Amino acid sequence: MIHAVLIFNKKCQPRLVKFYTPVDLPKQKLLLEQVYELISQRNSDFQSSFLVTPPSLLLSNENNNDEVNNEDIQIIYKNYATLYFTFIVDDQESELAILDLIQTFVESLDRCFTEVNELDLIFNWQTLESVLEEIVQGGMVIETNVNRIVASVDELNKAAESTDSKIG
């Protein structure tokens, strides 16, 4: 189960966090901070993409890849052009499941937001969210098909636009 997804821009700013389960918000915040931190230390070429960590590397510093861990929490990072997507999963969700979901998410985002910028993501946080949800649901990514996702997003955009002061 993905318990949360965080999308950050290249300058480490969080932009979206989704939490599929309740977890305590203070914990989520802390985690998001630590993950950000490591990300910063990791190089742009590394950007790590991931930080799995035994807890003890939670942070431990001595070999600075000390990764981050928090025990029971694996952190998967993905860098695309300019956004970073971090997915925090419980120890019971598989890394691949998390990666796939990420990859699919990213592809969709790129298709929908061909150029995503940070500002466009913010405003359209709901749109980004919707896509993320659809993908996720019943734990399940149920359409996997990038063409279906792309359509769905267009449908949602049409809705929100139709509503927009309730939205904008």
Binding site: G139, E143, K166
Partner: protein
């Protein structure tokens, strides 16, 4: 106004996320969920799903509302249905579950894959709470599990998986269907999941594991991914599926790992390396196929990889392999080592100079390995014994930097063994030892090495002509030494002098006499150690020596005999 509603909802959601009375917000969220706009419905639903936990009245209301929305055509019907279901699923009560199931059941039969997916996911969450509902809905799942749409199937599966986590018994019932779906899926993520599910069912039910294993490995063979490959491997290694019947599966999985390890990505590498090792502990044959892979990983800079390799090297060694490995490690460590010994830098590629890199614990492990390698078979086959001897001396040096004393101990023991074996090399070893001792660096930290050296020399003093320099070394260094060492040195020296005195006759030579005298003075000094035992041990030796001297003064020929005569006498007197 709809835009205002959206705002209210945002605020309520933020309040519910805090840990606030959700019951009070429910009424409002319920009204918003009745707004025709689909976005507002979605946000409302999200809130209620966050809120419902515990309050049953609220839940009941929220349910009624969601139901209405599900029934309404809805025309963005997919989205509305979709959200509502998620929503309902995240609500759990037995009453609600009862309602929801009926709704979900209907929605499972909608055409649109989006809806079907959501519906499935919902029934998952529901079942996560209420088993009776499951029982009733169990049938539908079975029908849905058979829909043509890969995303729907994937969902059905995940759901059955969760339900196994909570109920395994019902699903050990459906396992066959799951096995039939996995056999029909094209999609990698779907395959990956199905694989996990079976792993989950395996912890409960080995029978399933058997049926599914072969479904895994066929799927890995058809998917490329990479994750499906890793997965099959992790599942194989996990369920402990493996058991041996499953070796064949493991093999395929390994072969796929080896192909991948052989991709440049550290994530895939590490994962493979680990999986390899684990398998190797379990299956040496596989390892022999994967030595090459290991050696290549040794040149990788990633500490987890390195450590994983060294651990692999220990169970693989062949002679050609040994020599290669040894040299490679020795070289690496002169070039890979330092970083964490010095700090703890994170790794870099770039410095062209490279920060360089091994932890302290890696170093210790390396040395330990080397020693084992030299002693296995027995490496009667380092062909070049010279290299070993060198390596050992080298390690000792670097470790002096580490301490951890234990490194230093293990190394010493090994050296002793090498010397005992390979009579050639002895002379080389002795010379080096003597030099290392007179180089203070061994004295620092290293009492064990000193103790060993002491032993080696008493034994081999017979090889060495100049048993004088050795002994003048040792005598000068005795004052710098720990009590254990002092005890050892004392004991050795005495063991030696006995050998010399047997050979002295050259003249008796005056030198032997002087050397004895020196040893005596020293031991007297050690008779003043704070530990009574040691003190007594030294005093005994002092007397022993003094004797030999007297004997030499009065004789030469009679010295060996005299020593066996006098020494015991003294010893008994003291003890007596």
């Amino acid at each position: 106004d709809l835009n205002s509603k959206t705002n209210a909802v945002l605020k309520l959601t933020y309040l519910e996320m805090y840990g606030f009375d959700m019951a009070w917000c429910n009424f409002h969220i319920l009204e918003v969920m009745s707004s025709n706009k689909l976005q507002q419905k979605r946000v409302g639903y999200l809130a209620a799903s966050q809120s419902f936990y515990k309050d049953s009245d609220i839940l009941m209301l929220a349910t009624n509302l969601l139901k209405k929305d599900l029934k309404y055509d809805g025309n963005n019907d997919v989205v509305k249905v979709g959200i509502a279901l998620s929503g309902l699923s995240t609500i759990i009560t037995p009453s609600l579950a009862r309602d929801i199931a009926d709704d979900l059941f209907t929605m499972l039969n909608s055409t649109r894959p989006y809806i079907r997916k959501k519906a499935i996911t919902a029934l998952f969450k529901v079942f996560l709470q209420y088993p009776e509902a499951l029982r009733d809905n169990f049938d539908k799942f079975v029908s849905k599990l058979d829909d043509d749409d890969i995303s729907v199937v994937s969902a059905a599966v995940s759901v059955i998986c969760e339900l196994s986590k909570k109920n395994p018994q019902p699903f050990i019932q459906l396992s066959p269907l799951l096995y039939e779906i996995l056999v029909t899926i094209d999609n990698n993520w779907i395959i990956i999941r199905l694989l996990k599910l079976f792993t989950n069912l395996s912890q409960v039910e080995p029978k399933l594991r058997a049926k599914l294993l072969p479904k895994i490995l066929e799927l890995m063979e058809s998917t490329v991914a990479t994750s499906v490959i890793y997965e099959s491997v992790n599942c194989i290694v996990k369920g402990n599926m493996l058991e041996e019947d499953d070796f064949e599966t493991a093999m395929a999985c390994l072969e796929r790992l080896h192909t991948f390890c052989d991709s440049q990505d550290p994530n895939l590498r590490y994962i493979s390396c680990i999986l390899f090792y684990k398998i190797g502990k379990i299956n040496t044959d596989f390892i022999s196929r994967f030595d090459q892979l290991i050696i290549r990983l040794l040149s990788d800079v990633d500490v987890s990889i390195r450590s994983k390799a060294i651990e692999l090297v220990e169970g693989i060694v062949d002679e050609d392999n040994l020599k290669a490995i040894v040299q490679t490690l020795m070289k690496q460590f002169v070039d890979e080592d330092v970083v964490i010994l010095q700090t703890g830098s994170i790794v870099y590629e770039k410095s062209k100079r490279i920060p360089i890199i091994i932890p302290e614990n890696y170093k210790i492990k390396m040395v330990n390995v080397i020693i084992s390698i030299c002693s296995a078979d027995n490496y009667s086959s380092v062909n070049d014994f010279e290299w070993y001897n060198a390596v050992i001396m080298d390690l000792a040096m670097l470790c002096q930097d580490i301490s951890d004393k234990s490194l230093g101990s293990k190394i010493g023991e090994q050296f002793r063994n090498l010397m005992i074996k390979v009579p050639s090399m002895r002379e080389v070893t002795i010379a080096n030892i003597i030099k290392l001792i007179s180089n203070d660096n061994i004295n620092k930290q290293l009492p064990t090495v000193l103790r060993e050296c002491i032993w080696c020399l008493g034994e081999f003093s017979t090889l060495v002509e100049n048993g004088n320099d050795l002994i003048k070394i040792m005598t000068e260094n005795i004052s710098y030494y720990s009590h254990s060492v002092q005890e050892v040195l004392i004991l050795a020296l005495v063991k030696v002098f006995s050998n010399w005195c047997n050979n002295f006759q050259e003249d008796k030579r005056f030198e032997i006499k002087m050397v004895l005298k020196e040893l005596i003075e020293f031991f007297e000094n050690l008779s003043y150690s704070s530990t009574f035992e040691v003190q007594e041990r030294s005093v005994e030796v002092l007397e022993f020596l003094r004797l030999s001297l007297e004997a030499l003064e009065e004789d030469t020929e009679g010295l060996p005999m005299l020593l066996s005569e006098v020494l015991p006498s003294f010893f008994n007197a003291y003890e007596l």
